[PDB]
Design a protein around this motif. Structure first.
Motif, PDB file in Angstrom:
ATOM      1  N   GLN A  13       0.825  -1.202   0.000  1.00 59.80           N
ATOM      2  CA  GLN A  13       0.000   0.000   0.000  1.00 59.80           C
ATOM      3  C   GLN A  13       0.863   1.257   0.000  1.00 59.80           C
ATOM      4  O   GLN A  13       1.728   1.421   0.861  1.00 59.80           O
ATOM      5  CB  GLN A  13      -0.941   0.008   1.209  1.00 59.80           C
ATOM      6  CG  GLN A  13      -1.919  -1.156   1.251  1.00 59.80           C
ATOM      7  CD  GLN A  13      -1.345  -2.379   1.941  1.00 59.80           C
ATOM      8  OE1 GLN A  13      -0.213  -2.359   2.425  1.00 59.80           O
ATOM      9  NE2 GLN A  13      -2.127  -3.452   1.992  1.00 59.80           N
ATOM     10  N   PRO A  14       0.633   2.140  -0.970  1.00 58.97           N
ATOM     11  CA  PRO A  14       1.395   3.392  -1.024  1.00 58.97           C
ATOM     12  C   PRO A  14       1.101   4.277   0.178  1.00 58.97           C
ATOM     13  O   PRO A  14       0.023   4.234   0.775  1.00 58.97           O
ATOM     14  CB  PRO A  14       0.917   4.048  -2.325  1.00 58.97           C
ATOM     15  CG  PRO A  14       0.286   2.941  -3.115  1.00 58.97           C
ATOM     16  CD  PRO A  14      -0.297   2.010  -2.101  1.00 58.97           C
ATOM     17  N   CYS A  19       9.490   6.879  -5.113  1.00 56.27           N
ATOM     18  CA  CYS A  19       8.776   6.682  -3.857  1.00 56.27           C
ATOM     19  C   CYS A  19       7.326   6.280  -4.097  1.00 56.27           C
ATOM     20  O   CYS A  19       6.782   5.458  -3.352  1.00 56.27           O
ATOM     21  CB  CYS A  19       8.842   7.950  -3.008  1.00 56.27           C
ATOM     22  SG  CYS A  19       8.000   7.829  -1.413  1.00 56.27           S
ATOM     23  N   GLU A  20       6.687   6.851  -5.121  1.00 54.52           N
ATOM     24  CA  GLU A  20       5.313   6.476  -5.439  1.00 54.52           C
ATOM     25  C   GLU A  20       5.220   5.018  -5.874  1.00 54.52           C
ATOM     26  O   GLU A  20       4.294   4.303  -5.473  1.00 54.52           O
ATOM     27  CB  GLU A  20       4.756   7.397  -6.524  1.00 54.52           C
ATOM     28  CG  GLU A  20       3.276   7.195  -6.816  1.00 54.52           C
ATOM     29  CD  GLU A  20       2.416   7.286  -5.570  1.00 54.52           C
ATOM     30  OE1 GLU A  20       2.099   6.230  -4.984  1.00 54.52           O
ATOM     31  OE2 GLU A  20       2.055   8.415  -5.179  1.00 54.52           O
ATOM     32  N   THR A  21       6.169   4.558  -6.692  1.00 53.84           N
ATOM     33  CA  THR A  21       6.145   3.176  -7.159  1.00 53.84           C
ATOM     34  C   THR A  21       6.547   2.176  -6.082  1.00 53.84           C
ATOM     35  O   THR A  21       6.249   0.985  -6.223  1.00 53.84           O
ATOM     36  CB  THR A  21       7.059   3.006  -8.375  1.00 53.84           C
ATOM     37  OG1 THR A  21       8.423   3.222  -7.988  1.00 53.84           O
ATOM     38  CG2 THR A  21       6.677   3.983  -9.477  1.00 53.84           C
ATOM     39  N   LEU A  22       7.211   2.624  -5.019  1.00 53.74           N
ATOM     40  CA  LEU A  22       7.662   1.708  -3.983  1.00 53.74           C
ATOM     41  C   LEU A  22       6.508   1.317  -3.062  1.00 53.74           C
ATOM     42  O   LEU A  22       5.455   1.961  -3.026  1.00 53.74           O
ATOM     43  CB  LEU A  22       8.795   2.335  -3.171  1.00 53.74           C
ATOM     44  CG  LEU A  22      10.209   1.928  -3.591  1.00 53.74           C
ATOM     45  CD1 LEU A  22      11.248   2.595  -2.707  1.00 53.74           C
ATOM     46  CD2 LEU A  22      10.363   0.415  -3.559  1.00 53.74           C
ATOM     47  N   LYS A  23       6.719   0.239  -2.312  1.00 52.53           N
ATOM     48  CA  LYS A  23       5.721  -0.296  -1.400  1.00 52.53           C
ATOM     49  C   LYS A  23       6.314  -0.443  -0.004  1.00 52.53           C
ATOM     50  O   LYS A  23       7.492  -0.776   0.158  1.00 52.53           O
ATOM     51  CB  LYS A  23       5.190  -1.652  -1.889  1.00 52.53           C
ATOM     52  CG  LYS A  23       3.933  -2.129  -1.176  1.00 52.53           C
ATOM     53  CD  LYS A  23       4.244  -3.233  -0.176  1.00 52.53           C
ATOM     54  CE  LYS A  23       2.977  -3.750   0.488  1.00 52.53           C
ATOM     55  NZ  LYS A  23       3.265  -4.816   1.486  1.00 52.53           N
ATOM     56  N   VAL A  24       5.481  -0.193   1.002  1.00 55.43           N
ATOM     57  CA  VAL A  24       5.887  -0.261   2.403  1.00 55.43           C
ATOM     58  C   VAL A  24       4.630  -0.475   3.240  1.00 55.43           C
ATOM     59  O   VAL A  24       3.563   0.051   2.887  1.00 55.43           O
ATOM     60  CB  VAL A  24       6.653   1.009   2.817  1.00 55.43           C
ATOM     61  CG1 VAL A  24       5.805   2.246   2.585  1.00 55.43           C
ATOM     62  CG2 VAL A  24       7.111   0.936   4.268  1.00 55.43           C
ATOM     63  N   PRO A  25       4.686  -1.258   4.316  1.00 55.65           N
ATOM     64  CA  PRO A  25       3.511  -1.411   5.164  1.00 55.65           C
ATOM     65  C   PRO A  25       3.059  -0.062   5.700  1.00 55.65           C
ATOM     66  O   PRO A  25       3.889   0.801   6.035  1.00 55.65           O
ATOM     67  CB  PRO A  25       4.004  -2.328   6.290  1.00 55.65           C
ATOM     68  CG  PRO A  25       5.069  -3.141   5.650  1.00 55.65           C
ATOM     69  CD  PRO A  25       5.742  -2.229   4.659  1.00 55.65           C
ATOM     70  N   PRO A  26       1.750   0.157   5.790  1.00 53.80           N
ATOM     71  CA  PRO A  26       1.252   1.483   6.173  1.00 53.80           C
ATOM     72  C   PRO A  26       1.545   1.815   7.628  1.00 53.80           C
ATOM     73  O   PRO A  26       1.692   0.936   8.480  1.00 53.80           O
ATOM     74  CB  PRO A  26      -0.257   1.376   5.923  1.00 53.80           C
ATOM     75  CG  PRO A  26      -0.555  -0.077   6.069  1.00 53.80           C
ATOM     76  CD  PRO A  26       0.659  -0.802   5.554  1.00 53.80           C
TER      77      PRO A  26
END
Lengths: 318, 88, 63
Positions: B1-2, B48-55
């Motif tokens: 999720q972005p 950064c937009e294309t990357l993913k990280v837990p919210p």
């Protein structure tokens, strides 16, 4: 700071305009020569703003605001609901030697060692009365000036009155402080709550009756049942007396009695009920019930023992 | 999720501020270096937009110092109160 | 914590293109600046959360 000024402004706004001069005279904080400078003929807001300017010009602490609040509260004393406490001491203890400074120091130190942030203000007034205003707080918050607690204590007496505002979470702490500072052993709460402090004072000290004895028309109308009327008048006079009754406004009864009257004969469970009496001036309407023909000549003991038993809330079982 | 847009605009305004404060000392080769800086900033935002990280959840970063100071004060007050209560 | 290695290798994936000395110096300067900002922000966030939960625990304990 600004919080002190805001609190003072709110207190002044609460004060009525007609009696404002008396309150400021009793406060005795500002100099007398600074009072006639402000014109009281103008609008209330202008006067309030001018007084805020004058009190901000001088160094004003929170103690002065607390004293003003105490004076206003004792001048009104009818905006809050009051509760009573009873204090008991051991039979082996001699009569205590009451002292103002020792009591004040003990009461302050108990709260200072119990909590961390708390404001205490004292005022000793005539007929041996002590008014205590407490602003509560804890270690992680500043003292709150919006929800204070008022305590009235009478020296060398087992009774103390309190204002039911926010003490519900710190009632045992207040009771412990009171029973430690005055050198007593047990504290209990009596079932007596009312809004009129004078009525509670009269009832608790049982000085409401001061009648002491010492040596120092249309004959064509025939009233039948006259003997019954005179008998009920005599019974009412003997039961309710002749002295002016104290002013009360509420009474509560809880009933857990069985129903006895074919109807619910086999039932073995009590009939749970809750009854409330409300009136602008109780103990006087009940006096007029028997002559009006609504109730029988002798009233039930549950209604004629309010001042004698010094209770307001009743619980009755089978 | 972005991630949320709040941290994105926070990062973009810090990039703008640092670009401005490093350009303030620049005298020679002015416009091309700032054009390249803007291009790389936009590329970083896209990455950064294309990357993913837990919210994760939080509020705006402009009130970090005051909250930290009040938390330190509360911690010290609670600790001293607890020590006093334990000694009692 | 996962975008940090990516932003770390962005450095040497950008180094392979630029060759000017002043541009390289500027790149390194604001790269280390933003890296320090990211590290301090993450540390402040973590310690803020820890202080909040610790304060809640202590107020519960004292009450």
């Amino acid at each position: 700071d600004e919080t002190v000024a805001e609190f003072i402004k709110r207190t002044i706004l609460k004060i009525p305009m007609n009696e404002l001069t008396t309150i400021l005279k009793a406060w005795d904080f500002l100099s007398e020569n600074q009072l006639q400078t402000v014109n009281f003929r103008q609008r209330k807001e202008s006067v309030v703003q001018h007084l805020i300017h004058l009190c901000e010009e001088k160094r004003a602490s929170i103690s002065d605001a607390a004293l003003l609040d105490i004076i206003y509260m004792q001048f009104h004393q009818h905006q809050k609901v009051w509760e009573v406490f009873q204090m008991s001491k051991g039979p082996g203890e001699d009569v205590d030697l009451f002292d103002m400074k020792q009591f004040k120091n003990s009461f302050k130190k108990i709260l200072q060692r119990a909590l961390k942030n708390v404001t205490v203000s004292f005022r000793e007034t005539e007929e041996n009365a002590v008014w205590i205003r407490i602003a509560w707080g804890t270690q992680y918050t500043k003292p709150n000036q919006y929800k204070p607690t008022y305590v009235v204590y009478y020296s060398q007496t087992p009774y103390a009155f309190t204002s039911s505002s926010m003490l519900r979470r710190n009632t045992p702490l207040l009771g412990q402080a009171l029973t430690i500072a005055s050198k007593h052993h047990q504290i209990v709460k009596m079932d007596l709550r009312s809004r009129y402090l004078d009525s509670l004072k009269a009832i608790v000290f049982k000085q409401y009756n001061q009648t002491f004895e010492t040596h120092n028309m249309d004959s064509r109308i025939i009233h039948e049942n006259i003997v019954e009327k005179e008998r009920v008048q005599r019974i009412t006079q003997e039961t309710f007396g002749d002295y002016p009754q104290p002013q009360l406004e509420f009474a509560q009864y809880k009933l857990e009695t069985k129903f006895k009257s074919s109807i619910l004969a086999e039932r073995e469970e009590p009939l749970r009920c809750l009854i409330k009496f409300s009136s602008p001036h109780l103990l006087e309407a009940l006096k007029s019930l028997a002559p009006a023909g609504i109730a029988d000549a002798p009233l039930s003991p549950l209604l004629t023992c309010i001042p004698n038993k010094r209770m307001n809330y009743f619980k009755i079982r089978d | 999720q972005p991630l949320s847009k709040s941290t994105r605009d926070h990062l973009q305004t810090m990039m703008e501020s640092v670009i401005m404060t490093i350009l303030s000392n620049s005298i020679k080769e002015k416009e091309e270096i700032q054009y390249h800086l803007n291009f790389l900033k936009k590329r970083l935002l896209q990455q950064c937009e294309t990357l993913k990280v837990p919210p994760k959840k939080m509020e705006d970063l402009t009130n970090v110092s005051s909250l930290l100071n009040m938390e330190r004060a509360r911690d010290k007050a609670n600790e001293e109160g607890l020590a006093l209560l334990q000694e009692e | 914590n996962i975008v940090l290695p990516e932003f770390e290798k962005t450095h040497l994936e950008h180094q392979q293109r630029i060759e000017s000395k002043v541009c390289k110096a500027a790149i390194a300067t604001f790269y280390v600046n933003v890296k320090e900002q990211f590290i301090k922000m993450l540390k402040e966030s973590q310690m803020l959360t820890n202080l909040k939960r610790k304060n809640a625990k202590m107020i519960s304990d004292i009450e």
